[PDB]
Design goal:
The structure is cut from a larger assembly and holds chains A, B and C.
Chain A lengths: L13 E4 L7 E7 L18 E4 L13 E6 L4 E2 L5 E4 L3 E5 L16 H6 L1 H6 L5
Parallel strand pairs in A: 1-7
Antiparallel strand pairs in A: 1-2, 2-3, 4-7, 5-6
Chain B lengths: L43 E15 L10 E10 L3 E3 L2 E6 L4 E7 L6 H4 L16 H7 L5 H7 L3 E7 L14 E5 L5 H9 L4 E3 L10 E5 L7 E2 L1 H6 L32 E2 L9 E2 L37 E4 L6 E6 L15 E4 L10 H8 L5
Chain C lengths: L18 E4 L5 E4 L2 H9 L10 H6 L5
Antiparallel strand pairs in C: 1-2
The structure holds four RNA strands.
Chain lengths: 129, 369, 63
RNA sequence: UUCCUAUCAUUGAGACGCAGAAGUCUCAAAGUGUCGGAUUGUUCACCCGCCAAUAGGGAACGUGAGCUGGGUUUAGACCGUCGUGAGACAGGUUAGUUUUACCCUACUGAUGACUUGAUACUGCGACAGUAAUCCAACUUAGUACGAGAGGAACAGUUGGGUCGGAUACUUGGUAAAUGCGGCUAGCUGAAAAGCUAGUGCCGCGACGCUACCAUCCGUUGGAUUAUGACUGAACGCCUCUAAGUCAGAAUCCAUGCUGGAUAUGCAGUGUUAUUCACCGCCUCCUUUGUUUCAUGCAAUGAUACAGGCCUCUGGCCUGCUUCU
RNA sequence: UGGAUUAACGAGAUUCCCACUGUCCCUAUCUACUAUCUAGCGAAACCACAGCCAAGGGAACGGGCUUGGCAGAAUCAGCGG
RNA sequence: AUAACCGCAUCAGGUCUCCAAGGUUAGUAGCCUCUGGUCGAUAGAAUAAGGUAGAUAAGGGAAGUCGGCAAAAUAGAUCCG
RNA sequence: GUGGUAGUAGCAAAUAUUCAAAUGAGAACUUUGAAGACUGAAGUGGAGAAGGGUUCCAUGUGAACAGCAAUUGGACAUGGG
């Protein structure tokens, strides 16, 4: 039931990986709840579930299609209090087929709208926004 | 052959043709339906667009923004009081509606009278001079017609743009319908408004959906891409800001549904746009419960392209356009509509820091003469 | 009403304005304007700009 | 861009080896929608993924004075097979020019003469075009149903996608306001001021224009389709049908929205030429010239048709074939 | 009619990776010269006759023919059925 | 020889030789200048679409395409490697 | 021989002209001054060859020619070299 946020990452983007599962990278491949536009690259915002490969990381964790969630975003978006947040870097977390995160600890900041949706990623986060 | 990948259409066919309309103010079309039940009231207004600024209000919706402080963009519209002048009966025929008889007031100002001339400076200014001596010798012959016949009645009102900071003077005349009960009492409502300024608080209220008529801001002759929203062609001999294929061979004719180059903007055009604040020109307009600092809703350095020192109204065309407002065609309740409005803070600050000009003077201190 | 302040220039930010850069560690640097943000990209500091309230303060001007 | 339906999804039904969930079959349905990529010139195909669903087709196997030129199909050259050879191959391979609209129409926009006068303002709306449409979460509810696993729906609340129409408060983009500052080379005896390097470069840069890269907004009535029913014969009973009705959809027609120089359409209201100088209106009477059509070119209830009308205890209808 | 290799070299033919980008998602703004308007000057290809459509038949995809829809001066800028 | 030659012409084409200043720099590179030469190329007004050439773009970075085609990015000198 | 097309396409490379006075029937365009630019010594500078053949120089001018204009001219005419 997420509110719209500017979409900062198209399908092609290669982002950083927070958690202790051992992946350095996450290369995005598709997005959950993407409909139908001709020629539009499907893109993901803060907060939301995706699909990904790891490009470098632990060798069992490579060449598979994992689900991830997106946690920081360098593209700017408007909070309703009337200012524009934007983080330093794009980053995400490797996740199970339910929606739970795989590896428990989360480095970096996280967004408000990650912690607002997903209960588990709120707890393990160091400091939100 | 079929299309390959079945995309939706570029642009609506609802609005066509895309050509500049023959009118500078919005003509209303379709007033709301009559309840012989309510008292008699006016169902429309005219005002001039100014500029828009954001405001802070507390949401009352379980959304996640319940009890939180949301900034919102908000247009100020300058609305000095519209002076009622005439009244118009309308017979209902099988062809359509049809005007039976227009009655007018005794004494119109030169504000209204400019509308009837294209050259005011030359003329001897004769408009309603034979009528004025005829009026003193009034029109209770011709008002008796409107009581006997005539399903519909409309007050002729007009603007006061000498009070506005447009360089105008000319003043738009406008029919506004009267929707209450009893065809006699509609005329008695109109008669007692003759040479009286109708203010905005008579018509509209805080927390009300209004349907806004106007004309869009012009861009001249624009191409397919801007005009219709079309894909730009790839990096193509001849050029690439255009459609490739108009049409199939047959029909041996270009169809009207295909998008072409032409006019964009200056189109006559909304519904459900909430009024936040009715104001007064008579200080503390932008002052609220929360901030308690003395302000007028002019921002510093004017509205760019200026002042406003009249009655106005906020709410959720180009600058200096005559908007018309309308009372909504059915009174609707959508939770979103019928909302408690609460304004914390109206902004009156190129890129402004300070809310007021004395606040700037405090910061910089004793400057150099 | 309540009015948070700029990290760079120490000005006041009345609401519906500016922008909050979150850094790598997560210090939320607020700004008023693109003037401020794009000097924080270049990593020029407030102390060397004369117009800023910081250089003002340190060289016996204001207060 | 539009059209078709032999409907993949969405709407409303009916059938089941339909308990629920999930489906399969059929009817009214073309209103709305049918996607992102890897390999191949591909059409097809085959995978990875999303999704409500990734249905099939037509329009000179739509579409080259619209592009592209990867393929096929000239001239150069290579390989293999065939030929004694020149040469050949629906065998493979690489390199190889894509010309013109200013004409007519069509389509998109722009002015514009004229019609029981001029000129000005407010209007009416025939007709044409139309716009919204899908999904998810929260509660409903671990309820209905079920031996258990599993597991709905309507009303209500909150969002999202696609599409459409506006707008620039804020955020972002743009810079030749050459707006202010900084730097290189040259040139003016220097300093100061600048100028040339076709925008000399770098930073910020109002106004404007502008972006799902920003913000706002996207109506409520009638008649019916499939289908299910009511009353009820034909056929002492039964029967949704034969005569009579009723409910009923993402449908249709309105409404609303766009135009109306889309009806050579129509209405109301203002003022109508400095005083011999033209210009009206209403009578009276003469010059000419128009008419698709002068010889009484005539006549005002309102209905019904297995009934009506009244001058109404009676009378009339069976023709404007009459009565003036 | 040479077979198999091969450092250096190639405006040669292929594939992948890093860097980099408006190629792309997704378009937007700015500059000059144009197009546009005026003064002066001023061609050419092309041309049976001409130029609104639906269906019909017909040399089997009509601007003219038959049956319908219709049809209101004169003009400018574009466009590519 | 961007008007005396040849290209049908006072045609953005072609046609052998000599002399060759200052500053910046490795430099007859590019950029600015002195002597000598020239302002010859139809003008004025507006700043629409569409062009021709030239710039710049948040986030992503070849997902575009037959194909990274076009454009970006790299660039000098010294020291290390 | 003459139309329609049509006063239409078009006259947009080589950074650029401006102000005054004189001449003249007439000056955006000739000359002189003053400013402002460009060429930027492997120059649009100063000299030869091939090719051209009087284009050289002066004075004068009604046409035509110099794709606008023209008081100017490699044009036209009469002399000279």
């Amino acid at each position: 039931s997420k509110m719209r946020v500017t979409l900062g990452l198209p399908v092609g983007a290669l982002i950083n990986c927070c958690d202790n599962s051992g992946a350095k990278n996450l290369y995005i491949i598709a997005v959950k709840g993407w409909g139908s536009c001709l020629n539009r690259l499907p893109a993901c915002s803060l907060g939301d579930l995706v699909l990904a490969t790891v490009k470098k990381g632990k060798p069992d964790l490579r060449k598979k299609v994992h689900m991830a969630i997106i946690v920081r975003q360098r593209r700017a978006w408007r909070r309703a209090e009337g200012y524009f947040i934007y983080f330093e870097d794009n980053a995400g977390v490797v996740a199970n087929n339910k929606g739970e995160m795989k590896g428990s600890a989360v480095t970096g900041p996280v967004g408000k709208e990650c912690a607002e949706l997903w209960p588990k990623i709120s707890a393990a986060a160091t400091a939100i926004c | 052959s079929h299309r390959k990948f079945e995309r939706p259409r570029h642009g609506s066919l609802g609005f066509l043709p895309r050509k500049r309309c023959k009118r500078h103010r919005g003509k209303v079309k379709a007033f709301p339906k009559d309840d012989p039940s309510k008292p008699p009231h006016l169902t429309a207004f005219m005002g001039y667009k100014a500029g828009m600024t954001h405001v802070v209000r507390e949401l009352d919706k379980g959304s996640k923004l319940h009890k939180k402080e949301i900034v919102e963009a908000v247009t100020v519209v300058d609305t000095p009081p519209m002076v009622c002048v005439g009244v118009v009966g309308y017979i209902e025929t099988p062809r359509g509606l049809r005007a039976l008889v227009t009655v007018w007031a005794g004494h119109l100002s030169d504000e209204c009278k400019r509308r009837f001339y294209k050259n005011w400076y030359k003329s001897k200014r004769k408009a309603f001079t034979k009528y004025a001596k005829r009026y003193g010798d009034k029109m209770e012959a011709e008002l008796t017609r409107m009581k006997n016949y005539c399903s519909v009645i409309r007050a002729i009102c007009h603007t006061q743009p000498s009070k506005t900071p447009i360089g105008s003077k000319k003043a738009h005349v406008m029919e506004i319908q009267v929707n209450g009960g009893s065809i006699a009492e509609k005329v008695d409502f109109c008669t007692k408004m003759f040479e009286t300024a109708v203010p905005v608080k008579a018509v509209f209220t805080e927390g009300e959906m209004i349907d806004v008529i106007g004309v869009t801001k012009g861009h001249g002759v624009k191409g397919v891409v801007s005009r219709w929203g079309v894909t730009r062609l790839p990096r193509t001999h001849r050029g690439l800001r255009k459609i490739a294929c108009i049409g199939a061979w047959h029909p041996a004719r270009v169809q009207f549904q295909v998008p072409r180059h032409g006019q964009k903007g200056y189109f006559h055009r909304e519904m459900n746009k909430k009024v936040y604040r009715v104001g007064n020109g008579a200080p503390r307009n932008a002052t609220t419960e929360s901030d308690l600092t003395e302000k007028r809703i002019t921002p510093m350095g004017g509205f760019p392209h200026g002042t406003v020192n009249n009655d106005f109204l906020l709410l959720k065309g180009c600058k200096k356009r005559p908007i018309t407002f309308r009372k909504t065609l059915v009174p609707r309740t959508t939770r979103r509509a019928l909302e408690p409005v609460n304004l914390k803070f109206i902004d009156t600050s190129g890129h402004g820091r300070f809310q007021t000009s004395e606040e700037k003077a405090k910061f910089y201190g004793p400057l150099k003469s | 009403i309540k009015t948070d302040m700029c990290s760079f220039s120490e000005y006041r930010i009345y609401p519906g304005r500016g922008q909050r850069f979150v850094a790598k560690d997560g210090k939320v640097h607020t700004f008023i304007h693109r003037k401020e943000a794009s000097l924080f990209r270049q990593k020029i500091k407030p102390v060397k700009l004369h117009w800023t309230l910081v250089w003002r303060r340190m060289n016996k001007k204001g207060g």
